[PDB]
Design a protein around this ligand. Structure first.
Ligand SMILES: NC(=O)C1=CN([C@@H]2O[C@H](COP(=O)(O)OP(=O)(O)OC[C@H]3O[C@@H](n4cnc5c(N)ncnc54)[C@H](OP(=O)(O)O)[C@@H]3O)[C@@H](O)[C@H]2O)C=CC1
Ligand SMILES: NC(=O)C1=CN([C@@H]2O[C@H](COP(=O)(O)OP(=O)(O)OC[C@H]3O[C@@H](n4cnc5c(N)ncnc54)[C@H](OP(=O)(O)O)[C@@H]3O)[C@@H](O)[C@H]2O)C=CC1
Ligand SMILES: Nc1nc2c(ncn2[C@@H]2O[C@H](COP(=O)(O)OP(=O)(O)O)[C@@H](O)[C@H]2O)c(=O)[nH]1
Ligand SMILES: Nc1nc2c(ncn2[C@@H]2O[C@H](COP(=O)(O)OP(=O)(O)O)[C@@H](O)[C@H]2O)c(=O)[nH]1
Lengths: 338, 332, 338, 336
């Protein structure tokens, strides 16, 4: 059937998207920087590791990209590959830009000269809003990036927009708010929390060390968000969509709710760098704060309004935040048991 | 104090070099008819630097130890940016970050100016445009410059570096490149005056622009850099003129009295003095979004405002090209 | 004690090296591009995942490298990070050179400016000998690289030599021949073979598809090879050393021997692209040959002579090819059995 | 009319090669000059933007030009600079080569490619004389980067059957040679001493041995390599060394000096037999002890397979350079 090429195929979103596209009767081709016996762990969990054709394509290598497009002749390209860690982007800003900004343009150029009727999805992000200029944020909210990651992703957004407008290419920018699942990488706050709490329960770790507990995020369920990616690519005309839950919670709340499911009754004492999460049952400190996990420039709050995606795509979130936290904690408890 | 200027060979690099030398700076230019024209070619120290590669930038910074860096170097053509978007991004976006990251690594106390542009506003989201107007870039050039603007902001905010982004609207001078419409107009009219050319071919004469005088804009760049705290400013006149107005005013200096006949692609300019049809509109250039800056913040905070008027600007450019064309293409 | 910085810390050699250095009383710091919950799988197997401090350092980011040397202040640096896949190097030659050639020079420049008395080890390779000019190959054998990987590594070798000679820096180039272990990545032929056979035995996989079965390699045991890295770094003078077993076998032999341990009795039928490995017991095809796994320019044979390393370092190979095959096959049988 | 793309068009070799190719009816594109102006070809060469530091602009350039032949002569070519800027040197002299090869592979793999390699790759010479089969031993980041250039070109040839040649050229000189080089220093300085503008020529070890050829003949070897049925690599050299002393003395004779050499090593001096004045001396700033590493190329393979050999003798070479510099100093630094 339709051929899809998914960059970042072995990431959270690449895996769920591949599963969805396989169900829709696609041939799925994927490129990723993750190699080795455990790289396809996410595809293995979904039972699709035999059904995806992995090819070598690096966002930094224009000629490799050109060849890949020439060889695959994709009907749809989902650019999900990125250096996606915000904290690391301050340490490696140039590499971050080359992958997250210029790599988008390398794909667009390869498509323009090799197969211009190809549909293109760019994995944009609520991180682009940074120091939010409106609350809630919509497609019309002015951007204010606060990390090299966010600045590079903003280039990726605007270059996608420009190829759509200037070349009449079918190019969509998905402005997705934080979305999570049991496949979320442990580098990220939500999975860091559940993975750590599970290990703390089974005595494999002493404490959970975090940065900014006051940070507020709109957190959704990734399987639903990749559905949104597919849906916008099926519209007769290309456009950009905010995909979000419309609901915001602190990192603190995530920890409390997760920890409850893990059997800890958290109380907070102290303030700022000195704040601690204590299991009320035992008086033990479970959660601590370290300046190491704070970003040089922080993003205090994100909350999206996905009204446009409801009206044009019929997309709406289904999984509640409380459901999300359970899903994640339960999966990680099981993992640490096994 | 030592200043390092990228794009030293351009309109703005040359005028800025002039101004800084007058202020007693040692001036280093990263790599000139413009510097010769200004008589400063032996007063500027030229050094190699390439925005395409990182290690040479580090070395340049270590060698020069600049107090101020002005990043004026750019692939600055919009049409070229559609043909070569990646090269454009490497120079106009990543090259900015390369300089910032070099300063961060070896000389973080250095002041940094980024040469941003009203092209970042693109499909304008407010009229007039201020520092708070949302951006809407419409070319790979404008997209790359937007990255340059935001990355400068981020280095300021993340590291408390002295990093300023100047959002400059169109500025012109006798040193303006012939590639640009203002020079095209003044240069063509002088050639027409001396019978070396028959007509000037242009786009939509209704098109509006905020045109200032380049030497006053490089002054705003320096002023931004002398403030106690770094910030970003819109630098502009805050008034638009049509291409038609520019042409008429330039024509008058050349001895023409233009009567306009027709509309849109049909519009032509006929000299009342001779009856010659000297201006025409082309399908090539004709296009059926008012870019105009509100520079009040620059006035309030820097005490900067335009001094040279539009009429004066046009006169300055016309008198220079009338003289150039005389000297180069007309018998004594 | 002494501080060591190991790039590529989560790969086979980085893992084993970290273990050795910890046993020698070092503080061990590591940078690696592999992240997430299964990135430290090798360090987890060796029981050292809590004794290694992982820092972010990418060989593509000069300023990140500089900052890392500044923070760590290492006494010894082992540059084990690489795009180390030969087949992929033909598809991504520039990225390969940027990591494997220029990355070496980036580290050396950082050391020269931050901490010039740091001892430096470069992970060079028998692959540099390519179309071999002498047999066996020694430190004095003229190079003849046959892939962009090998050309890049050759630059890495010569730039290390040059920094030693021109700056009197303690810089060593280890010319290590192929070395393997149960921690070897599945992208490489040996582990591909053992991993695939275990899965075939258990009906997780149908066939093992390989390329050039005629290729001859000198295959050693990785733990013994990282010992040699440390040994060269402890010598009065810096120098370069071939580390090898001196014994050469075909890929075909590797397959035969591994399959036997797994319970297959392999018969080879056909020739070239049509050659197939049949289980004499069942008549089923276990092994087949695909054009896709052949390299554009091949390395027909590598075999080293490590007599300088014996004479100068007291280093000798202890584990035989036959022992290595058993070690690898046994671990992969166990893994699939769980 | 075949199309040639030359990188490093502004150099000694770029200019002479452009001249030769035009003479052979090529359309010549130079990637970006007093040298081109001197040759009278400044208006016959199409100058285009290309930068070896970045990949996408190379691809576009190849697509636009559609060259039949690419000659990569662009380099950061200074050894001293290479120690100061080793990374930039490698980006231009190593990775830049791969960028061009990878661009041809992607959009025009039938294009012939010449890589400008160098005797500096031999460095600490592993044989004397050196041939295509002599093992390399680079001794600077310039030489290490150039070594990458050579081998990546070999690999593209072998891996993809691309027409890719690496010319291992020993020192070659001409009136177009830059002043930073000892041959021009000698000839330029001696022309200035003749006309009273300078007192002395100050050098290093006069016993220093070099293989010096005539640049136009060397670019001819480049073209010849590219015209063979099969691509291959060649040492292009004279096969004979002369001393710095021999260069100076022959040069001096052309300038009107009759040089007697008095002393040894750092204390050696050139004295004019006619006046008794010290014309030449050796300084500690330039002096290096006896060189064990004699760079001298055996070009027998080039003769056997290309029919290439040097035609301009050493004496002819020195004369050519000295006559050009005498004329230049007369035209520009002394009154009529
Ligand atoms: N998850 C979220 O809540 C949101 C994420 N985003 C974006 O969504 C996308 C996917 O998210 P997620 O699944 O969490 O990301 P992951 O980090 O889990 O996956 C990204 C993948 O990209 C690969 N990659 C990195 N660099 C390159 C490159 N040079 N060439 C090819 N592949 C490369 C990585 O490989 P390797 O593991 O080897 O490094 C990794 O597998 C990313 O673009 C991210 O920035 C945007 C909005 C919300
Ligand atoms: N093993 C052998 O038989 C021989 C190996 N070699 C060399 O020895 C070294 C180590 O071998 P081995 O352990 O098998 O190699 P591995 O591939 O297993 O490990 C190399 C590591 O380097 C990391 N890496 C890749 N690119 C970068 C970069 N951009 N910056 C920082 N880190 C990066 C990889 O991370 P990620 O997983 O995310 O890609 C990977 O974990 C390599 O240099 C290899 O080329 C030489 C001779 C013999
Ligand atoms: N990654 C990470 N984030 C943390 C941590 N502690 C607090 N945070 C905050 O949680 C928020 C979400 O971070 P993350 O999950 O990494 O995704 P982000 O939106 O890309 O920053 C940010 O504001 C972080 O500053 C931590 O230990 N790791
Ligand atoms: N990687 C790999 N190598 C193979 C395969 N089949 C045969 N080989 C050969 O096995 C030899 C060793 O390859 P590898 O383990 O990848 O290490 P190498 O020496 O770096 O190429 C090479 O000559 C390969 O061509 C295969 O399926 N994968």
């Amino acid at each position: 059937g339709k051929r899809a090429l998914i960059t970042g195929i072995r990431g959270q979103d690449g895996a769920y998207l591949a599963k969805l596209l396989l169900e829709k009767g696609y041939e799925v081709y994927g490129a990723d920087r993750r190699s080795g016996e455990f790289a396809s762990w996410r595809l293995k969990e979904l039972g699709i590791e035999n059904d995806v054709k992995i090819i070598h394509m690096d966002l930094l290598e224009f000629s490799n990209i050109i060849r890949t497009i020439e060889k695959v002749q994709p009907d749809e390209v989902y650019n999900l590959a990125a250096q996606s860690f915000v904290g690391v982007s301050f340490e490696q800003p140039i590499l971050t830009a080359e992958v997250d900004a210029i790599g988008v343009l390398r794909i667009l150029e390869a498509l323009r000269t090799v197969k211009p009727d190809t549909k293109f999805y760019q994995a944009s992000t609520s991180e682009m809003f940074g120091k939010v200029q409106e609350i809630p944020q919509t497609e019309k909210t002015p951007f204010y990036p606060r990390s090299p990651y966010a600045v590079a992703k903003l280039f990726g957004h605007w270059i996608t927009v420009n190829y759509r407008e200037a070349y009449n290419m079918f190019a969509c920018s998905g402005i997705l708010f934080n979305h999570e699942s049991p496949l979320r990488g442990i580098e990220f706050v939500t999975r860091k929390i559940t993975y750590s709490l599970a290990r703390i329960k089974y005595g494999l770790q002493d404490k959970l060390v975090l940065g900014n507990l006051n940070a507020k995020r709109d957190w959704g369920y990734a399987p639903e968000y990749v559905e949104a990616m597919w849906l916008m690519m099926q519209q007769p005309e290309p456009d950009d969509y905010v995909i979000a839950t419309g609901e915001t919670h602190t990192v603190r709340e995530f920890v409390e709710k997760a920890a409850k499911i893990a059997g800890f009754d958290i109380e907070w004492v102290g303030e700022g760098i000195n704040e601690k999460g204590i299991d009320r049952n035992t008086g033990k400190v479970i959660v601590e704060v370290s300046e190491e996990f704070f970003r040089p420039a922080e993003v205090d709050i994100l909350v999206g309004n996905p009204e446009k995606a409801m009206k044009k795509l019929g997309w709406k979130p289904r999984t509640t935040f409380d459901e999300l936290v359970e899903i994640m904690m339960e999966a990680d408890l099981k993992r640490v048991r096994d």
